[PDB]
């Protein structure tokens, strides 16, 4: 429950401001950046700042501070999730979100902030339906704005009818410095690009363990869906009943389901390395990289980052397969292997220098994070079974799918 939604620059002056209730005065935004530096330099950097009785809920963009002010007990996650939805809708609208978009396209953005929120209440925050009556190129509002189904307007028509499914894996991993797995979970996310005609209804078929236990087919290969969080469009009561993903799809690109599970399968790329940290001379990274998965998949464009000392100099890399760029701007290396097959081990030997004089402060030991990407492969083994298009007209759409294995935060701790 915010009284005034604000966007500041990186200095603290108003890029754009939008009050709703008058509970927060407009002059109180000027205290934000001094309070930001005041709490930040003492380690009290929080998304909620305070100035007496006025709060400052904020998320941070690259150049923008979406300041959301309230005075009374605001509903907090309401405010922060509306900030994220404002970020997502404006990123749909303005593909780069900078001060050139704020200070020059100011005709439409005040109207957007008036439409998305009244009195501190988000009412209609979908991007595609808001496109249909808020343009920069006006008629009545659509009934889909007023409809229960408020993500798919009638009147959409395409020549061909294609449904593109993107099963994207993301292996989360935190391997300690000893060499054991502390957490091997997988957050999977299916994003769909649906180009259909009218008001279709889609029933997704998956190889669920729980659904096959409801069926009696729980002895074949299946996925153990530990948790799934769906879009609004999925009728969740029917999914609670019999694991049924029943949804009218939104139009275009949208993420259907964000599932999460735990996986006791070995990690995809194992990183072993020894570090011979000599005093004031040099460092050595005898890093090896073996793949534990099958000998049929090839990991595209991996970027195995090893964090390095900050003031290293004269970099040397005796590699076997793959190029290295030393990135001292982030104080790291990028050992890039474009084609990384499965079942193979590629060695890399790095050698640096080190200044003879020590530093005033320490540097820290960041873990190893790699950036693999594998097509036609799911580590979970999850497979889409069917996708029944339901239409009053009645036709044959094209449910296409590809399997992508990527990473989430694929961390391996260093010495």
């Amino acid at each position: 429950s915010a009284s005034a939604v604000y966007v500041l620059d990186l200095k603290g002056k108003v890029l754009i401001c939008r009050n709703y209730r008058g509970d927060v005065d407009m002059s109180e935004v000027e205290h934000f950046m001094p309070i930001l530096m005041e709490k930040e330099e003492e380690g009290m950097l929080s998304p909620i700042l305070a100035h007496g009785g006025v709060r400052f809920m904020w998320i941070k963009h690259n150049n923008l501070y979406l300041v959301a002010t309230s005075k009374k007990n605001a509903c907090v996650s309401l405010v922060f999730s509306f900030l994220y939805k404002v970020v997502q809708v404006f990123s749909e609208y303005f593909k780069e979100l900078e001060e050139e978009s704020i200070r020059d396209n100011f005709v439409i953005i005040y109207e957007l902030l008036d439409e998305l929120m009244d009195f501190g209440y988000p009412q209609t925050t979908d991007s595609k339906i808001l496109q249909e009556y808020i343009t920069q190129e006006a008629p009545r509002p659509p009934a889909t704005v007023t409809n229960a189904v408020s993500w798919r307007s009638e009147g959409i028509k395409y020549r061909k009818n294609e449904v593109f499914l993107d099963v994207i894996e993301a292996v989360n991993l935190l391997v300690s410095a000893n060499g054991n797995v502390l957490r091997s979970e997988i957050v999977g996310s299916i994003k769909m690009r649906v180009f259909l005609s009218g008001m279709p209804e889609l029933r997704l078929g998956l190889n669920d363990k729980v659904l096959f236990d409801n069926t009696g087919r729980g002895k074949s290969k299946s996925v153990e869906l530990e948790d799934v969080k769906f879009h609004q469009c999925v009728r969740l009561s029917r999914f609670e009943n019999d694991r049924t993903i029943s949804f009218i799809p939104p139009d275009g690109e949208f993420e259907l389901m964000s599932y999460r599970l735990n996986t006791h399968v070995k990690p995809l790329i194992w990183i072993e390395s020894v570090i011979e940290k000599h005093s004031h001379s040099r460092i050595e990274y005898m890093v090896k990289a073996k793949s534990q998965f099958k000998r049929r998949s090839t990991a595209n464009n991996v970027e195995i980052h090893i964090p390095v000392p900050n003031d290293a100099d004269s970099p040397k890399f005796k590699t076997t397969v793959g190029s290295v760029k030393w990135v001292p701007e982030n104080s790291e290396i990028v050992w890039s292997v474009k084609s990384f097959p499965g079942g193979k081990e590629y060695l890399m030997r790095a050698h640096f220098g080190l200044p003879s004089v020590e530093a005033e402060d320490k540097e820290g030991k960041p873990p190893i994070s790699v950036k693999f990407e594998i097509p036609y492969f799911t580590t979970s083994g999850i497979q889409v079974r069917y996708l029944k298009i339901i239409e009053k007209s009645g036709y044959q759409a094209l449910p296409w799918v590809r399997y992508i294995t990527q990473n989430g935060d694929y961390q391996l701790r260093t010495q």
Binding site: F164, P375, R385, Y386, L387, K388, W400, V401, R402
Partner: peptide
Amino acid sequence: TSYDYCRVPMEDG
């Protein structure tokens, strides 16, 4: 989208 697609069966009755 250099990674090509695969077609699923529609019904799986």
